[PDB]
Amino acid sequence: LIYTAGGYFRQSLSYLEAYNPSDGTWLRLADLQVPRSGLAGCVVGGLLYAVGGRNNSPDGNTDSSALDCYNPMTNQWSPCAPMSVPRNRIGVGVIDGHIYAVGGSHGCIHHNSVERYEPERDEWHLVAPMLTRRIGVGVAVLNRLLYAVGGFDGTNRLNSAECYYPERNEWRMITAMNTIRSGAGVCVLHNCIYAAGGYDGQDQLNSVERYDVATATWTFVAPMKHRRSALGITVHQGRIYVLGGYDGHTFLDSVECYDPDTDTWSEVTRMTSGRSGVGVAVT
Template sequence: MSSEKLKEKMENIPTFGIDTFKLENTSCYRPKPVSEKPSDGSMHFTIMKHPKEMLEVMNILRRSQKLCDVTLSVGEEKFLAHKIVLAASSQYFKAMFTSGMREEEMNTIPLHGISPCTLATLIEFAYTAEIRVNEMNVCYLLPAATMFQMNHVVEACCVFLEHQLDPSNCIGIADFSSEHGCIDLEQKAREFIQKKFCEVIDCDEFLTLSPCQLIGLIKHDELNVRCESEVFNAVIRWVQHDSEKRLCKLEGLLMAVRCYFLSPNFLEKQLKHCNVLKLLPQCQEYLSKIFEGLKLHQTCLEKPRKPCAPLVIFSAGGYLRQSLSHFECFNPCTKQWLRLPDLTIPRSGLSSCFAKGCFYTVGGRNNSPDGNMDSQSLDMYDPMRGSWISKCPMSVPRNRVGVGVIDNMIYAAGGSQGQHHHASLERYDPDLDRWTTLGSMATKRIGVGVAVVNRLLYAVGGFDGQHRLRSMECYDPEKDEWHFVAPMNVTRSGAGVIGMQEYVYVVGGYDSHSQLKSVERFNTISKRWEFVSQMKSPRSALSVAVVGDRLYALGGYDGNDFLSSVECYNPDKDEWIEVTNMTCGRSGHGVAVGAEPSRL
């Protein structure tokens, strides 16, 4: 048929039908696409309104009790319906009416285990595809919808409950969803409990957990806690809630707590003052052995918990012709950088660390065209709030300072103020927002690298005002004493220093003649140094970080340029590869590893 004749036929369609066949109304009528033009010139239409209109007519018939072929009874209540509609909405009713069951021939079918109100709601959904879920009816709708295998209603209830998740109800929702086979909702509720653990333990539902449930919860690697003492305190609170029945469970619960990550000070206080522990000598003995092992700096065999969010490398400040205020983080999995709120004051020569879930910047110097000023500042970035908070400053300014963390306490060693070089050490307590002066090193050190292994602090290399250093000193926090250990193979200041497994790694640095690409590590067990593969680029005033089983070297100065490149070391293969570039070259920046900021 020619296009002219087709147009003529379309124009001769009676006016009463013209609105029905307008193709522009694609929400109601959609031509079915065909790969070839039909030989008879026909068009295929899908009438989108038709199913809804059919349901509306059937619902009108139900309400007027026309053509109904089944009556559902609950107690004294009767509900007329059409078998075909119920069977189409529910696998339960489909099996009842089509599988040769005796109900297939019955006109009235009694139902049990459901309220009349809930059945009325489900029948209404079968005819309208609409349902209102709220706090009052969800506990009745979900079990009934599960029983009748009305999966769309089950999904609606699960979505509603997921949006209701709160520290005060998440345990109940997890148990409720498990009871009714809602696997996805249960998993989301369990993940919520782990993520919000510190809030959940303050709610009444936490105290209703069974011993098995509590053990299963606190064993999770992904339990989101700032320090293990929060888990310990939660266990004691749970026992105290019903000590007569629960005291006998404490020993098993303590085995699930990662007690080797508790600080000796915390354990000592619990052993002296916890009334629950005093009733159980076997628990006191167990914790006493851990306490002694920690004081002796024995190797910890337990694995640390994993954060709920991916681990990222935070980088703050640095120097590129002047001090920088840059603050950003790098995700090794996605290979992406994210810009974060700038430092309040530009700084280079600073050090950074994580303590109790927050990122800290310590000391440094603001080198600017207006003049240089050494810093004694301590600033904290809260990844949950995305903001900086100034904390108690150190006793003295410290540029090119070394920093380490033991038992969630921040230790700041060495550094300089003007021409004065420090040998001193001080410690910051985040709970008290207070610094305490400790025993000094034997040697003044700026550009010193600091690492922590088995709760011992190692100060490596640096510059004493006259010479670059090979020496390394070790600090014992229990004795408040420093002692020398085996010196490095190479003189280094401004090296990247970090603890990884039983090793202290020392990366690059400056030896008074040139920037270094060599890398060596100290085995804290055998007390020996050994070289490993060297980096691709020489670097001094670089920063290093450990994520998982990989060591990252970021930025630094190679003698000519400020580097933006980042190299990654694989200890298993003993090789370095370049993995990314920072947003700009820099040296003297502070880095630390922590959980990805929540606002991502």
């Protein structure tokens, strides 16, 4: 099932909920220990991890270096070692069972730094920094290479993407997206890096485009029905789901589903309550 952790609606949230695309219904689980928005989620060894973010509350706005791990058959969170720095609006990806933490912000500092986590050793380690400072960065893994896509460097929203090679611990710029996207949902479906929605400094976006590594080309596909940034994104049974986000007016509860065979989006469910800035992963 598709798990959503954290989010924002008037304050950062602690919710953990699971949607099942078969039954159409939602299941409510254990709260995060600390509320977080702007976090990322991923799954390693079947366990779901919540990475970075910020606790935006009536009493504070503290950026998060936390890493916490949740177990689906214990329904228990337990803390792991924290990162070198707080990273709000972080991106994450998984290569070889290891979590890479990319970019994000701490106050007015916009990180280009990156670090890697080891679940069997509960250790963070710093790797090579990106070429670009990127908050609201989208991250994807394809052929075991790590891609950092879009974001905001503090002045400009970005259409650039760059690629990390783990045996070359070096960053390489690639072909830019057609669209500037901060806070897009970025995932891999088929064997393309998809970038959906986001914010370009003027409008929240409903357009979607995908990267083919062999031809180094980005191509548009069908747009979502409603513009959205700070969406959670995941792939389930060969299909993309986008969860919530902010459309410039409303915190959406809409969940849209992209069918790649038809190049069609459909509204499939409502989240229990509208929210943005979640971490999503499937297990």
